DNA sequence: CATACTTGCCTGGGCAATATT
DNA sequence: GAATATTGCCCAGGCAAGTAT
């Protein structure tokens, strides 16, 4: 008797889907020497253009110290630069460098929609949309 | 300005945040027993198998073998799991639950019950949940 | 005092060598 | 040769204590 599937039938399922997505995404991003997490953060910064670590934390749903070390790694890889914040002397601003935008465009052009297709190759557009709706309805 | 990430994987942030919520909830439910969600999961698998090799356990958990080795080390140091020489393989190891491991496992089972499945699926109907699972399994390899 | 990092310690997973058999 | 651990080096997140403004 599987105690875990008795308590949370969804649990293993959600976990495994998330894992599949992570593995696939990493495989696709692999030839450009960037990870899925790093790429995700780069995309968020790219959305905001300019953003503070706390708001970035809000967007990614992640711990602030974790994001700090992430930003350290991103800076050392020359994808991200830290700027002073004209509105606050204790905070900083985070923005993409030229290389950041570069590798974002490289990721976009390389991966395209191949990943989205492979991940949902067993589903139809209606099934994908329904899955999306249900999933977001799970969100509090 | 537009989301490149969301453009490439429309379900990415969504599955991630759902899974994260699930994990945070399960961790908060298991708080007083001083056992994490992952640890409890491995304890469950070992419990079902009764006896199991780390390779088979790796396949049933879908986790790296080395990571699993370290997890098993943690579970041993907390006196929940024991390793023993595998009588059917000279190079293998069998893993099993200690009495305390099975005890805290049962403690968890009785503690959380269906509260987690309930709180996670409260915004859904019965067959909304059923459909959700169906689709989720069909996605899986 | 309140906020924004910042760092340290911990669990945890992925990948890459090792023995061991 | 092939499969089974085990270990080391990474990246990565949660948590808490400390720092800066």
Residue at shortest CA–C1' distance from D8: B66
Q: Are A102 and A34 in contact (CB under 8 A)?
A: no
DSSP A11-51: HHHHHHHHHHHHHHHHHHHGGGT--HHHHHHHHHHHHHSEE
| Non-local CB neighbours of B111 within 8 Å, separated by 6+ positions | B29, B30, B32, B33
Please say whether the beta carbons of B18 and A135 come within 8 A.
yes
Among B7, B11, B119, most A C-beta atoms within 10 A, so best to mutate, is B11
What residue spans of B36-98 are helical by DSSP H? 37-49, 54-61, 65-77
Q: Are A46 and A38 in contact (CB under 8 A)?
A: no
The number of folded domains in chain A is 1
Residue that has been written with the tokens 């030839």 in this structure: A31
Per-position DSSP letters for A101-114, written without gaps between them: HHHHHHHHHHHTTH
Q: Which helix (H) or strand (E) holds B15?
A: helix B12-29
Nucleotides in chain C with any atom closer than 7 Å to protein CB: 3-9, 11-17, 19-21
Q: In the 89-128 stretch of chain B, whose C-beta falls under 7 Å of nucleic acid strand D?
A: 89, 91-93
Question: Contact at 8 Å (CB) between A54 and A64?
Answer: yes
Instruction: Provide the shortest C-alpha distance from residue B134 to chain A (in Å).
Output: 10
Q: Burial-class residue A2 by CB neighbours within 10 Å (0-12, 13-18, 19+).
A: middle
What are A87's two structure tokens?
A: 């509105």
B7 within 8 A of A47, measured Cβ to Cβ: no
Q: Chain A residues with CB inside 8 Å of B6's CB?
A: 43
- Which method resolved this structure? X-ray
Rounded Cα distance, A126 and B11, in Å: 14
- Resolution of this deposited model, Å: 2.7
* Packed helices B12-29 and A9-29: angle between N→C axes, nearest 10 degrees: 140
Radius of gyration of chain B (CA): 18
CATH assignment of the domain containing B33: 1.10.10.10
A 10 A CB-CB count for B51 gives 12
Q: Looking at the C1' of nucleotide C3, which residue has the nearest alpha carbon?
A: A90
The pair of structure tokens assigned to B54 is 């780390």
Q: What is the rounded distance in angstroms from the CA atom of residue B105 to the CA atom of residue B45?
A: 11
Q: Scanning the structure block, which residue is given the tokens 């696939």?
A: A24
CB B133 within 8 A of CB A11: no
Nucleotide nearest to A61 (CA to C1'): D13
Q: In what order do the strands lie in the sheet with A50-51?
A: A50-51, A88-96, A80-85
CB atoms closer than 10 angstroms to residue B125: 11
Distance CA A124, CA A86 (A): 48
Q: A39 CB near a chain B CB, below 8 Å?
A: yes
- What's the length of chain B? 141
Residue in A45, A137, A131 with CA at minimum distance from that of residue A95:
A45
Scored b (16 or more CB within 10 A) or e, A98-118 reads eebeebbeebeeebeeebbee
Whole-angstrom CA distances from B61 to B28, B31, B44, B124 are 22, 22, 10, 27
Residues B115 and B29 sit within 8 Å (Cβ to Cβ):
yes
Chain breaks in chain A (C to N over 2.5 A) after: none
Residues of chain B contacting residue A16, judged by C-beta atoms under 8 Å apart: 62, 140
Cα end-to-end distance, chain B, whole Å: 34
CA distance A126 to A123: 8
Query: Whole domain around residue A2: which residue ranges?
Result: 1-140
Strand D nucleotides, any atom under 7 Å to a protein CB: 3-9, 11-17, 20-21
Supply the DSSP symbol for B51.
S
**Residue position matching structure tokens 């495994």:** A16
| Closest by CA position to B62, among listed A7, A19, A113 | A19
């Amino acid at each position: 008797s599987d105690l875990f599937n008795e308590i949370i039938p969804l649990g293993r399922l959600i976990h495994m889907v998330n894992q599949k997505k992570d593995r696939l995404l990493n495989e696709y991003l692999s030839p450009l020497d960037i990870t899925a997490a790093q790429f995700k953060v780069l995309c968020s910064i790219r959305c905001a253009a300019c953003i503070t670590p706390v708001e970035l934390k809000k967007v990614l749903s992640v711990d602030l110290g974790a994001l700090t070390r992430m930003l350290d790694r991103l800076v050392s890889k020359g994808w991200v630069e830290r700027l002073p914040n004209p509105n606050d002397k204790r905070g900083v601003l985070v923005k993409l460098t030229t290389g950041g935008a570069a590798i974002c465009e490289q990721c976009h052009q390389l991966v395209g929609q191949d990943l989205h297709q492979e991940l949902t190759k067993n589903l139809t557009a209606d099934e994908v949309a329904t899955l999306e709706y249900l999933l977001k309805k799970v969100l509090p």
